[PDB]
């Protein structure tokens, strides 16, 4: 069985979203919906996912831009990995 989350998509633009918008970007399996991406994320990092935007990339993978609630801090969640 396939896993929802593949790995954190870390790039300059990903950083800006994390520092400035409290958003975490991930490389997720392309068969995963926004909702699945949401759950998986909350469960894996114990946070509150507010919104998820997806985009099927020219790399063959799906990218997910996940925004965490003001309650959580992306910068911190990402720093532990």
């Amino acid at each position: 069985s396939w896993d929802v989350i593949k790995h954190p998509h870390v790039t300059e633009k990903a950083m800006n979203d994390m520092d400035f918008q409290n958003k975490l970007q991930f490389a997720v399996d392309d068969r995963a919906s926004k909702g699945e991406v949401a759950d998986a994320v909350e469960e894996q990092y114990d946070v509150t996912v507010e919104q998820v935007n997806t985009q099927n990339t020219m790399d063959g993978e799906k990218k997910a831009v996940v925004r965490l609630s003001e309650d959580d801090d992306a910068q911190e969640v990402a720093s532990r990995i």
């Binding site: 099927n56 020219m58 790399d59 063959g60």
Partner: protein, 46 residues
């Protein structure tokens, strides 16, 4: 033109297959990518 998720996957593979043989392989093999495809000079399938 409007491409589908499947198409996009293929074009994607092709782009990747369009990278060069890494330097390290040259050494590991004591010594060419015969599948180099230019977007203008070559034509993909479909």
């Amino acid at each position: 033109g409007k491409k589908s998720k499947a198409t996009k996957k293929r074009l994607a593979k092709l782009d990747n297959q369009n990278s060069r043989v890494p330097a390290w392989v040259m050494l590991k093999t004591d010594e060419r990518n015969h599948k180099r495809r230019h977007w203008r000079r070559n034509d993909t399938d479909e």
